Structure 1
């Protein structure tokens, strides 16, 4: 519950193919919000899933997405799916019943992602 219970406020879970976009999101988020690219030993309050064509094709990415949602946004943790570079028709069906940010929104979805992160940080002590 403590804002300091975790070293980072948000990390970006991405596939190698989208390194650049992920770095821009991290940059956008930090402009305070502490951000980084997600990694094995990475632990933050919020986790952004950069769901792209490369992400959906990668078995490890999909499994990570699964674990990200395993213990997260049901309503407890903070997992933010960001659909980027994908046709809506190719979106994972389950998202229809879940919260997510569309990449066609303002700032490629970056703005709503940052907002979602802040909303969650405000609920911390």
Structure 2
């Protein structure tokens, strides 16, 4: 059998500042826990110019995604314009991301995020690791 069913299963979009974290948390599931194949596609230095790529269905082909960033960094226009896919430009119920926030009242993230999510991980309670528990709540769909 060569014909594949999907190209991407899980993607962890985060800053290189936590390259070790994303790889540490992903390593847990990669083992014999979730039995999935997650990949980290960090921003790469473009060759120069930049065009408007067609609808990236690949990003929507994924099942789940882990998003871990700061309230000050995510506040940037790049993160907002990039996360636009998770804001409104989403598939429907796939490629869902889990943005971790440290007790933010819509001060760091836009109002578009308004939904039945409720960002958790406020104060120094180990929000970083909490990202692993967040993705665990998504598996509930496979019950």
Which TM bucket (shorter chain)? 0.5 to 0.7
Aligned residues: 125
By how many angstroms is 1:121 displaced?
3.9
Q: Report the aligned-residue RMSD.
A: 8.5
Query: Which structure shows the higher strand fraction?
Result: 1
Where does the alignment leave 5 or more consecutive residues of structure 1 unmatched?
A: none
TM-score, structure 1 as length reference: 0.53
Higher gyration radius (CA): 2
> Which aligned pairs between 1:36-47 and structure 2 lie closer than 5 A?
44-47=62-65
Comparing 85-94 with 51-60, which one deviates more in the overlay?
A: 85-94
Q: Which runs of 4+ in 1 moved over 6 A?
A: 1-4, 31-42, 85-88
The 1:112/1:48 distance shift into structure 2, 3 A limit, reads same
By how many angstroms is 1:67 displaced?
1.4
Distance 1:111 1:83 in 2: 12
Q: Deviations over 1:23-76 (max 9, x none)?
A: 333234449999999999795211222231463254332222111333448656
> Which residue pairs with 2:75 in the alignment?
57
Q: Aligned with 1:97: secondary structure?
A: coil
Distance 1:6 1:61 in 2: 26
The 1:96/1:57 distance shift into structure 2, 3 A limit, reads closer
